[PDB]
Every structure is written in structure tokens, then in C-alpha cells.
Design a protein around this ligand. Structure first.
Ligand SMILES: Nc1ncnc2c1ncn2[C@@H]1O[C@H](COP(=O)(O)OP(=O)(O)NP(=O)(O)O)[C@@H](O)[C@H]1O
Length: 161
């Protein structure tokens, strides 16, 4: 009990630093490398917090060679990416990785009734930024999540001549 306003203005380096101190308790070889300055995106520190955790849970339990949590940003668009060692995505699964949008006139559902815990997807989906997956030779997988910032005022230096 105590108010509950979600999706608001939050720093991406501030939310990741919270999940870092939480996921860094015993061998969670998490290499932190956030934008050394100050990010700023209106997001939900909750959903995002869970989005970074469930991401390392796959490299910590099965994986155990190296985990990496980094965050960057740009003018009118900040984002954060992760990296972990392991086998990487499969050759066939790369095509069926919880991809949204379908194309067909029939689904042919045989079974699979229960709950729908698609965490992570609704996260970047509730922000409206981006979500992509990459892998270097199925050896160095890295996640690319984006979070667009609300209108701002950043021009930079520009001489007239
Ligand atoms: N670090 C990763 N991040 C995102 N996708 C990954 C990663 N490593 C592998 N993948 C691919 O996505 C799947 C792993 O994460 P995820 O998509 O959550 O699993 P899932 O098979 O869809 N559900 P489950 O594995 O039962 O928890 C694998 O089947 C790979 O094809």
C-alpha cells in the first residue's frame, strides 16, 4: 500500500544498477558497462527489472563462463544490451523464438492450455521501443533492447562560419 504509478520517467542506468546489485551475489559474473553519463527514458523500473533478471537466469544456471550487463544511449533514444557465453540460439529455433505477428488462415492448435507467462515481451512492448536478438557464430549471443525517450531538447555544438 503506497501509491503505484508505473511507466514514468526513469534512468536506464539506474534500473540496471539495481538489477546488477541484486544479480551479483554469488558468481554472477556480470560485467557492468552502462552509459557513463546519464540516461533518461520514461519506463517502468519494475517490468524492466524483471526483464534483465530472467535474461541472466539462462546464462547463470546452465551457463557459467561469463555474464555481461551493459547499457548505452543516444540523442532521443536510449537502450541496453546483454551478452553471455553458451551454445547460442539453435539453427531451427532462430525461426520460432516467441515471434509476434503470424501469417496464415489456420493455426492447427493441437494442445498446450494453461497460463501465458511471456515476461520480457510485454516489457519492451509496453515501452514501444524495440527488441532484437543477435549471435556471433552461435557463441556470443547479445540482446538488443531499445527504449525511445519522450521529446527533448538536444542540439549540440554547431558553428555558422
Ligand atoms: N540469451 C538469449 N536471449 C534470447 N533468446 C535466446 C537466448 N539464448 C538463446 N535464445 C533463443 O531463444 C530461446 C531461449 O530463450 P527463450 O526464447 O526465452 O526460451 P523458450 O524456448 O522460448 N522458452 P523456454 O526456453 O522453455 O524458457 C532458445 O530456444 C533460443 O532459440
Amino acid at each position: 500500500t503506497g501509491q503505484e504509478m508505473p511507466m514514468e520517467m526513469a534512468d536506464l542506468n539506474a534500473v540496471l544498477g539495481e538489477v546488477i546489485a541484486a544479480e551479483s551475489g554469488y558468481e554472477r559474473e556480470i560485467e557492468t558497462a552502462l552509459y557513463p553519463g546519464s540516461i533518461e527514458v520514461k519506463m517502468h523500473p519494475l517490468s524492466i527489472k524483471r526483464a534483465v533478471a530472467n535474461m541472466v537466469v539462462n546464462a547463470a544456471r546452465y551457463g557459467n563462463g561469463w555474464i555481461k550487463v551493459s547499457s548505452g544511449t543516444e540523442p532521443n533514444r536510449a537502450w541496453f544490451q546483454v551478452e553471455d557465453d553458451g551454445p547460442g540460439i539453435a539453427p531451427e529455433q532462430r525461426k520460432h523464438l516467441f515471434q509476434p505477428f503470424v501469417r496464415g488462415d489456420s493455426a492447427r492448435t493441437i494442445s498446450g492450455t494453461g497460463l501465458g507467462l511471456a515476461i520480457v515481451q510485454r516489457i519492451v512492448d509496453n515501452h514501444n521501443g524495440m527488441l532484437e536478438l543477435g549471435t556471433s557464430e552461435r557463441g556470443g549471443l547479445s540482446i538488443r533492447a531499445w527504449l525511445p525517450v519522450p521529446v527533448t531538447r538536444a542540439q549540440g555544438t554547431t558553428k555558422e562560419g
